[PDB]
Amino acid sequence: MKIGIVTGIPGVGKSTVLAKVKEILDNQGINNKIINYGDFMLATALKLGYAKDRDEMRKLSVEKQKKLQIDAAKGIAEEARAGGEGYLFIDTHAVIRTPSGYLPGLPSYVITEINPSVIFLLEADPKIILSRQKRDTTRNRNDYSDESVILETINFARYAATASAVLAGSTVKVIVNVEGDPSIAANEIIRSMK
Amino acid sequence: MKIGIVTGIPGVGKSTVLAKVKEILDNQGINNKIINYGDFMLATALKLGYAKDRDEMRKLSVEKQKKLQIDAAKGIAEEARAGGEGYLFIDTHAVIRTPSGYLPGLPSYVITEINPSVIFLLEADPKIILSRQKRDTTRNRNDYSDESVILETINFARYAATASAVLAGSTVKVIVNVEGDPSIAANEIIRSMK
Amino acid sequence: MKIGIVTGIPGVGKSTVLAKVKEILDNQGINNKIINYGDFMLATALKLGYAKDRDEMRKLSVEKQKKLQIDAAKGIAEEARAGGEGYLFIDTHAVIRTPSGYLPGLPSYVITEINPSVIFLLEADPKIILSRQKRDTTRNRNDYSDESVILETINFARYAATASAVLAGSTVKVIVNVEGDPSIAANEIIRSMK
Ligand SMILES: Nc1ncnc2c1ncn2[C@@H]1O[C@H](COP(=O)(O)O)[C@@H](O)[C@H]1O
């Protein structure tokens, strides 16, 4: 399975687009799997003892976390080798905004274990992302004060994703998520895996 | 020792802010060391005959600067091991303007010796930085002619620091140094270390 | 020999600038070699039987191209150590635009084998790049639709070149290619190599 990492800053509509990518690939009868990196990390944590739930996993020693990310990364690469023909997409972050600053989602020890073909950056107009902050308060962590915060996050995601791309030899692709339709992004993503 | 790297372009008030961090951590009795990267570079340079003053080290061939960089990094790595517990702040740069172009302050061979937790980008409005540079003649710097050169250097600092963050697994925090109030930045810096 | 990597996005006048670097150095009797990374790749293909022309080379498996990229990188490093004093310049790309997104021209497994001192980024005004687009069809590049795509390509190139510079510890030099005279750029390239 050819691997593609789909990243997006909160509010871009990454879950809707991913739902559309699966729907379109199933309809063409094309083998595909969509893995949520955080969920697979937790699954990995459960299988190897490290922790029994998220809070437990999150309050873990930095040296343990780095091991766990490596094992999850190795695990996902296995899933891809085992699934044969198809497309495996990872749903993760290029950068995670934290109070302590931007944390790269694909650091060297993770990215070179996975070796993806493509890293996607889901972007939209900062205005459209601010509207999707108060329109759908399905988490509402209201971290995006003004659009200058969104812009800055977009940019750090761009810098971090390219640095991860340079490490693995993968391409970086910007995909605009159209407000109306999620199918535009979904087809651009599918076109890129060809 | 928990390492935090504090970078900033010349004129952001890196020192002002760093003094205030020592004040605040000394006053609450927390063990903290503040090392200036360039001071360690100059020591090694002086003993080898490469340069006499800090403002000439950046004019050196890329290969000599690389040598000083590795030596300094090995030194600071040693001081961090003999610190036991508490916060170590490395006062340095994300990028160094040189006749040969921008030299990354935290290349892979430096990042592997230190392994910071957080990498800070101290920033300020370019107009405010342009002024601060003319008020200091214990340094100088004729390369910061207009506001265009400062923007471009703030950007390369961002690109470079994020690439370094991605290699290390560390976070990158942009801190605005509020004109006239070093304690804001100093406190964001302290909170981010927790 | 000191290694310099000269990159530019299509349409900046890189081959012209590279010719002046050769003439100015010849008329100074400085030893210099100017290698095209893809050509060196092609050469290694032939002498290993993989491919026979640029066209059949660009069709090879991903694992095969990667093979060619490493050996070519290693090879170019031997050529520079063998060549004694002097300046070796590699003409390649910082990023390449592909249907899958931006492909880093200097991934880790390549930049760490070459270990340049300088990575140059030739830029020009977007308008100028477009102006040369209608003017020459040695090629006929109809990929640059508008100036916003030129801008994006430029930033990705900076992002990637900086990341590559952080892995090898090389500088990143932006060189503006002036439209009237290609010597402004070649003198800067040469100055930067001292
Ligand atoms: N991490 C670094 N890598 C390379 N050169 C550095 C680094 N940190 C500082 N320098 C150099 O040391 C000089 C003085 O440091 P500063 O006193 O903090 O300006 C700089 O202008 C650079 O020439």
**Domains with residue ranges and CATH for chain B:** 1-194 (3.40.50.300)
**Residue identifier of the C-alpha nearest atom 13 of ligand 1:** B38
Residues of B in contact with C166 (CB under 8 A): 104, 106-108, 160, 163-164, 167
In terms of Cα–Cα distance, which of C127, C123, C124, C102 is closest to C6?
Answer: C123
For residues B129 and A135, give the distance between their C-alpha atoms in angstroms, rounded to a whole number. Answer: 39
A153-A157-A161 Cα angle (round to 5): 175
For residues C66 and C78, give the distance between their C-alpha atoms in angstroms, rounded to a whole number. Answer: 19
For residues A93 and A113, give the distance between their C-alpha atoms in angstroms, rounded to a whole number. Answer: 16
For residues B120 and A93, give the distance between their C-alpha atoms in angstroms, rounded to a whole number. Answer: 21
B56-B32-B22 Cα angle (round to 5): 75
**Residue identifier of the C-alpha nearest atom 2 of ligand 1:** B105
Residues near C145 by Cβ (< 8 Å), separated by ≥ 6? Answer: none
Q: How many CA atoms lie within 13 A of C122 on its CB side?
A: 31
Concatenate the DSSP letters of all residues of C94-111 into one string.
Answer: SEEEETTEEEESS-HHHH
Residue C49 neighbours by CB distance under 10 Å: 7
Q: Please, what's the b/e burial string for B107-124 (b: 16 or more CB within 10 A of its CB; e: otherwise)?
A: bbebbebbebbbbbbbbb
Residues near B145 by Cβ (< 8 Å), separated by ≥ 6? Answer: none
Could you give the dihedral angle defined by the CA atoms of residues A176, A181, A182 and A188, in that order, rounded to the nearest 10 degrees? -50
By the 10 Å C-beta count (0-12 exposed, 13-18 middle, 19+ buried), B144 is classed as: buried
For residues A103 and A152, give the distance between their C-alpha atoms in angstroms, rounded to a whole number. Answer: 13
Say if residues B7 and B120 touch (Cβ distance below 8 Å). yes
Entry resolution (Å): 2.6
For residues A84 and A146, give the distance between their C-alpha atoms in angstroms, rounded to a whole number. Answer: 45
Q: In this structure, what token pair is assigned to residue A52?
A: 């029994």
Q: What are phi and psi of A183, to 5 degrees?
A: -70, -25
C194-C24-C154 Cα angle (round to 5): 70
Task: State whether residue C14 is helix, strand or coil.
Answer: helix
For residues A27 and A3, give the distance between their C-alpha atoms in angstroms, rounded to a whole number. Answer: 20
How big is chain A by its Cα radius of gyration, in Å? 16
Say if residues B8 and B121 touch (Cβ distance below 8 Å). yes
Cβ distance A173 to C100 less than 8 Å, yes or no, reads: yes
For residues C95 and C159, give the distance between their C-alpha atoms in angstroms, rounded to a whole number. Answer: 9
Residues near A31 by Cβ (< 8 Å), separated by ≥ 6? Answer: A1, A25, A83, A84, A85, A86, A87
> Least CB-CB distance to C118: which of B69, B100, B164?
B100
In terms of Cα–Cα distance, which of C92, C154, C99, C94 is closest to C128?
Answer: C154
In terms of Cα–Cα distance, which of C163, C173, B103, B91 is closest to A104?
Answer: C163
For residues B93 and C66, give the distance between their C-alpha atoms in angstroms, rounded to a whole number. Answer: 34
Residues of C in contact with B102 (CB under 8 A): 162, 165, 171-173
Q: Please, what's the b/e burial string for C166-184 (b: 16 or more CB within 10 A of its CB; e: otherwise)?
A: bbbbbbbbbbebbeeebee
Say if residues A161 and A121 touch (Cβ distance below 8 Å). yes
For residues B155 and B159, give the distance between their C-alpha atoms in angstroms, rounded to a whole number. Answer: 6
Residue at token pair 């995670």: A96
Instruction: Give the distance (Å) from ligand 1 centre to CA of residue B143.
Output: 15
Rounded alpha-carbon distances, angstroms, from residue C67 to C56, C79, C146:
15, 18, 36
Sign of torsion over alpha carbons A145, A147, A152, A153: positive
Say if residues A163 and A95 touch (Cβ distance below 8 Å). no
Residue at token pair 């690389």: B66
Give yes or no for residue B41 CB within 6 A of ligand 1: yes
For residues A179 and A128, give the distance between their C-alpha atoms in angstroms, rounded to a whole number. Answer: 7
Q: In this structure, what token pair is assigned to residue C189?
A: 């390239």
Residue A82 neighbours by CB distance under 10 Å: 10
For residues C158 and A163, give the distance between their C-alpha atoms in angstroms, rounded to a whole number. Answer: 11
Residues near A130 by Cβ (< 8 Å), separated by ≥ 6? Answer: A11, A144, A146, A147, A150
In terms of Cα–Cα distance, which of A4, B29, B167, B140 is closest to C163?
Answer: B167
Distance from the C132 Cα atom to the nearest Cα atom in chain B, whole angstroms: 26
Say if residues A100 and A154 touch (Cβ distance below 8 Å). no
For residues A72 and A41, give the distance between their C-alpha atoms in angstroms, rounded to a whole number. Answer: 5
For residues C29 and B23, give the distance between their C-alpha atoms in angstroms, rounded to a whole number. Answer: 58
For residues B94 and B8, give the distance between their C-alpha atoms in angstroms, rounded to a whole number. Answer: 7
A37-A42-A45 Cα angle (round to 5): 125
Q: In this structure, what token pair is assigned to residue B146?
A: 């207009």
Give yes or no for residue B92 CB within 6 A of ligand 1: yes
How big is chain B by its Cα radius of gyration, in Å? 16
Residues β-bridged to residue C33:
C88
Residue at token pair 């290619």: C177
Say if residues C183 and C24 touch (Cβ distance below 8 Å). yes
Residues β-bridged to residue B36:
B91
In terms of Cα–Cα distance, which of A103, A119, A89, A107 is closest to A153?
Answer: A103
> Least CB-CB distance to A100: which of B118, B163, B168?
B118
For residues B2 and B7, give the distance between their C-alpha atoms in angstroms, rounded to a whole number. Answer: 16
- Mutate which of B9, B18, B35, B37 for ligand 1? The one with the most ligand atoms within 8 Å of its CB, which is B37
Q: In this structure, what token pair is assigned to residue A133?
A: 């902050």
Task: State whether residue B82 is helix, strand or coil.
Answer: coil
Say if residues A154 and A97 touch (Cβ distance below 8 Å). no
Residue A184 neighbours by CB distance under 10 Å: 16
Between chain B and chain C, the number of residue pairs with CB atoms below 8 A apart is 71
Give the distance from CA C48 to its chain's centroid. 24
